[PDB]
Amino acid sequence: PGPGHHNAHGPSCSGGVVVASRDGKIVCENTLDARLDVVFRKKLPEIRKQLVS
Amino acid sequence: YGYVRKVSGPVVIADGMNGAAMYELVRVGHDNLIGEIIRLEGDSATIQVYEETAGLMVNDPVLRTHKPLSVELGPGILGNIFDGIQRPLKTIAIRSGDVYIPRGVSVPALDKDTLWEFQPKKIGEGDLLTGGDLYATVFENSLMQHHVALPPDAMGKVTYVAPAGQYSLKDTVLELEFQGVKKSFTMLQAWPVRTPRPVSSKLAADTPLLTGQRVLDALFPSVLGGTCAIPGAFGCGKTVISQALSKYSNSDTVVYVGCGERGNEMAEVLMDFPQLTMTLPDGREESVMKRTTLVANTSNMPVAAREASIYTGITIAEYFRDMGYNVSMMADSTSRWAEALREISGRLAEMPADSGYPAYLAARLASFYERAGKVKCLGGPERTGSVTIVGAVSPPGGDFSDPVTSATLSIVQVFWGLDKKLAQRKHFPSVNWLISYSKYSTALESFYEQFDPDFINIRTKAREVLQREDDLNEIVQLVGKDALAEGDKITLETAKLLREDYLAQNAFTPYDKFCPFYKSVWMMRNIIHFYNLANQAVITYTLIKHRLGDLFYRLVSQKFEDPAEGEPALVAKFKKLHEDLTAGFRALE
Amino acid sequence: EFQRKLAESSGDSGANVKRLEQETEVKIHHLNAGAEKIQYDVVQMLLKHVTTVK
Amino acid sequence: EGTLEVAMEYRTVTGVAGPLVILDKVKGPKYYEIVNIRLGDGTMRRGQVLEVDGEKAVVQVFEGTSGIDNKFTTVQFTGEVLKTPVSLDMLGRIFNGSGKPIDNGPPILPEAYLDISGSSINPSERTYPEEMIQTGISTIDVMNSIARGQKIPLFSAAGLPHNEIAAQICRQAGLVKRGEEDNFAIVFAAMGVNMETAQFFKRDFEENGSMERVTLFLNLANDPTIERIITPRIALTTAEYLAYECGKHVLVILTDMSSYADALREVSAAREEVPGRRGYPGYMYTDLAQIYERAGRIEGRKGSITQIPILTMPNDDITHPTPDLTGYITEGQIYIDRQLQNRQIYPPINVLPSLSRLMKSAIGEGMTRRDHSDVSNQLYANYAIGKDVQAMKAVVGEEALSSEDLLYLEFLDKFERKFVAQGAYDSRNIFQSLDLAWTLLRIFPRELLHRIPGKTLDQYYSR
């Protein structure tokens, strides 16, 4: 269907795509912002370990 | 939009409600039967309807409300009479004319066509306001001025302010815009009963609830914004204490809440309140209804309304406290509320717990009771109110072992303990000193010492005297008064005098209808100081008893004095009597 | 005697407060050294955010 | 490393009932996966997926099912069990039931994410508690002592000062000192406490100046009932990280364990599980194990977790399921008597039912005295005989107390008067108290004493 009617906003969504089945019941919000949030929350202990020492 | 599919007694299943939300109240059928949503299985819903569901038709319409069980607050909330589900009984009776409550009444909670005098604060048309800001106040009636607080969860820069004048609730008294979008607010605020009211900070209670009765004021004090418990089942003590709270308590408002009691008992109490009248300290005479709100749900009322009456009342009390007023709720029968909850649980087939009550009974009672307390307001200007609950308990046969009683005793800080034995012995206060307690005395000690540093020591001495009273009781029981020493005899006589002169009140008598804390403190001083002064002289008990007849008469009359003379005169008289008693005790020694 | 004993406290508490303020400033300078650790580690964790594969 | 994945957000919620939220068409669920539910209004709340069957999922929301629409709410499957971001910096702070920092402070920067309900310690690697503790109260230390690694609760009915006793113990907590870095760090769980009690705890802890070494996990009665179950889990997980993974000994405290029992009962009744005694879940023993059965000392590490729960008999009955199961699991009891409170005793510890199953190892020659065991046994056993003498006097008369029974009655009177009573801030040392304990045992003749040998106390000398 594409963004032909509505689209992820530019500054609010730096990039990436979202893929959802019919009727939008199941959605996989695979955008770059969410990817960064997840990787940040996962790698935070490494960040703390490297900030010290 | 929405049609019923299965109607099995109270339970109702309605299709075509995919957008329905859990615990969202709904209107069922042409008769506008009101019920709450329980399970949203599939695209269908599930509703338990409060009133009788007899006569429902399959495919009869079901109309959503998009709101949980909520109460419409605002002007006109005081004085009226409301059902458990926030139904104005008086206006319903006037409109329908007949006496019976119609099955499916749709009268709004407050009359939206009546006019109230409105005047805004000094706020400007383009200022900034936030949730909880007091932007106007309304003279709903004389001497009960009603502040109009901007509803919480609403904020933004001011756009329009209604100038002072005559207005109704349907008028758009306020309009403002937070973002580019603008919202207009009327004088009516809706709030769900289950959700508490937003608070800024839970303060520490620091002011006693002066009930006007000496036994509650001094022996077992209760603090503003503090829970209270009454084992009220007979002796009319609950009625007496409720009347005392309505007439003389420091609270600016009272919200009685009656659930599931005898219908004629509620008739008697709801006819008693209008007859009750209280005089102003400025000499004015008012009616208690002008500051009283009443939520009465008899046994004939639907069980769900009986369960929801308590939450309705506590939400009303919280709304009153939102403008910093001190308000006191009075749950008539928590045992009836627990029985209603048990019936609802049995309807839902929830797994039974101890003695048959559902496992969440203690948790829900604690959640309800935790709403009481002195709280800083939300939004400016700065002010602070309080909500105190004096909810009573009705243990079965007086055995404080039922789960309702146990949970209440575990949660409530102050338990006053009315005793039927005292009522049999013709005791007007009927408060059993042997079982009552006030766990808030440690926090109240600051004010107790600020008023009088010796008052707390006097209270401790009185507690010791009461503890020794039962000791002397079995002493007389086993050997008699002969074995009592002179000091023991003096202690016993002083305990008896305290019980029959100060610890007991006369209620009906005009002189002892209301006991000011000043008179109570002077009486306690004139009793305890005399007790000590007689005690250290041990002197023959018979001799001092003979020579203290005038002192004994003065001590007895230290409570017979009417409050007409006022605090300056009565305090002087009590001080003179105490000085005379001290001189008589010391000179004759 | 009690007032004389407590007079030294009015200075001791202030000295302890000043010492605590200086220690907090030094700890933040270690967080400014952490800001130096930032200067040495910001590029590191920014290149750690290359998880843009598959 | 395996490439990351963004959590799938579902909207197929197809049923709500009780506290359980049903889902359908779930693509690859995971048991006990934490799911945060976003309602149509936009507010968010957490929840766990209780039962996973086929492509369905029966989620138990935390903040309550109210406000969930079968066609507007969205559920996001994080794909990982609940984990508490434990860190050494967490010391000296206050957290909500789930762990939200409520001290107006920045959130925890985790040194490591650790899953709650950590695996058991291999009992081959488990060791035995071998050191006494200086709490600061006489009667607990002198008799039925507490070992550095021993679990033992406080039995105390409602209205009793057990909260004040807990606060005093936490503020006066310390090692025997017979070090500050490894000194007692106290994790203070608070399950279902009143608001006034919460403010009291906060003020008392801030006043003692030991905020630098105490963590509060406050959970008020206003908070959701399910969120109270995870509070002890989080507290014990943080304690495990502090003790085993950092070294410092932890003195875990949980108040109102009966509130936790009530939360378990409510949750079980919600899901309609098989009920044990008094309607409690049939697995309450296992849950109370997973809470209590973590105190101990691990061989390879110098840490130690000491557990001091605080129960409350509902009907003041020891036979209630919660205290009974606890006593089955908790390795001893320190008992508090309402009857002694009626006598205006500030620490109403009744010693007759109070025994420490690990006291036989806490005592010895490295600490205490060589007559500790026998003196404790005598002051434990003669109290029962004094109580029997009192009962006989009540049912017969004052003349029933013979030349021997009257001695037991006087022993009981002096024992309840002087020995048990103590100051609200008195740190009564063991030897000074053991001298008075010897005097109490010596009220009875030095030859009628049956269990104790004369030589044991004879090694010690008066004055």
Curated annotation (Swiss-Prot), chain A:
**GO molecular function of the protein, one example?**
proton-transporting ATPase activity, rotational mechanism
Give the residues of the full protein shown: 174 to 226 of 230
Q: Which family does it belong to?
A: Belongs to the V-ATPase E subunit family.
By what name is this protein known? V-type proton ATPase subunit E
A GO CC term assigned to this protein in UniProt: proton-transporting two-sector ATPase complex, catalytic domain
Alphabetically ordered keywords of this record? Hydrogen ion transport, Ion transport, Transport
Q: Which domain of life is it from?
A: Eukaryota
Q: Which organism is it from?
A: Citrus unshiu
Q: What does this protein do?
A: Subunit of the peripheral V1 complex of vacuolar ATPase essential for assembly or catalytic function. V-ATPase is responsible for acidifying a variety of intracellular compartments in eukaryotic cells.
**What binding partners and quaternary form does the record give?**
V-ATPase is a heteromultimeric enzyme composed of a peripheral catalytic V1 complex (components A to H) attached to an integral membrane V0 proton pore complex (components: a, c, c', c'' and d).
| UniProt keyword annotation of Membrane present | no
From Swiss-Prot, chain B:
Supply the Pfam families for this chain. Answer: ATP-synt_ab (PF00006), ATP-synt_ab_N (PF02874), ATP-synt_ab_Xtn (PF16886), ATP-synt_VA_C (PF22919)
Q: Name one GO molecular function term.
A: ATP hydrolysis activity
Q: What is its EC number?
A: 7.1.2.2
Query: Keywords, A to Z?
Result: ATP-binding, Hydrogen ion transport, Ion transport, Nucleotide-binding, Translocase, Transport
Binding of ATP, residues = 232-239
Q: Which GO terms describe its cellular component?
A: plant-type vacuole; proton-transporting V-type ATPase, V1 domain
Stored InterPro entries: ATP-synt_VA_C, ATP-synth_a_Xtn, ATP_synth_asu-like_sf, ATPase_a/bsu_AS, ATPase_F1/V1/A1_a/bsu_N, ATPase_F1/V1/A1_a/bsu_N_sf, ATPase_F1/V1/A1_a/bsu_nucl-bd, ATPase_F1/V1_b/a_C
Enzyme class comes to translocase
Give the UniProt record's GO annotations in the biological process aspect: ATP metabolic process
User: Sorted alphabetically, which SUPFAM superfamilies does this protein's record hold?
Assistant: C-terminal domain of alpha and beta subunits of F1 ATP synthase (SSF47917), N-terminal domain of alpha and beta subunits of F1 ATP synthase (SSF50615), P-loop containing nucleoside triphosphate hydrolases (SSF52540)
What reaction(s) does this enzyme catalyze?
A: ATP + H2O + 4 H(+)(in) = ADP + phosphate + 5 H(+)(out)
Q: Which domain of life is it from?
A: Eukaryota
Signal peptide residue numbers: none
Question: Which family does the UniProt entry place this protein in?
Answer: Belongs to the ATPase alpha/beta chains family.
- NCBIfam families membership: PRK04192.1 (NF003220), V-ATPase_V1_A (TIGR01042)
Q: How does it assemble?
A: V-ATPase is a heteromultimeric enzyme composed of a peripheral catalytic V1 complex (main components: subunits A, B, C, D, E, and F) attached to an integral membrane V0 proton pore complex (main component: the proteolipid protein).
Report the function annotation for this chain.
Answer: Catalytic subunit of the peripheral V1 complex of vacuolar ATPase. V-ATPase vacuolar ATPase is responsible for acidifying a variety of intracellular compartments in eukaryotic cells.
PANTHER family listed in its UniProt record: H(+)-TRANSPORTING TWO-SECTOR ATPASE, V-TYPE PROTON ATPASE CATALYTIC SUBUNIT A
Entry protein name: V-type proton ATPase catalytic subunit A
What is the phylogenetic placement of the source species in the record? Eukaryota, Viridiplantae, Streptophyta, Embryophyta, Tracheophyta
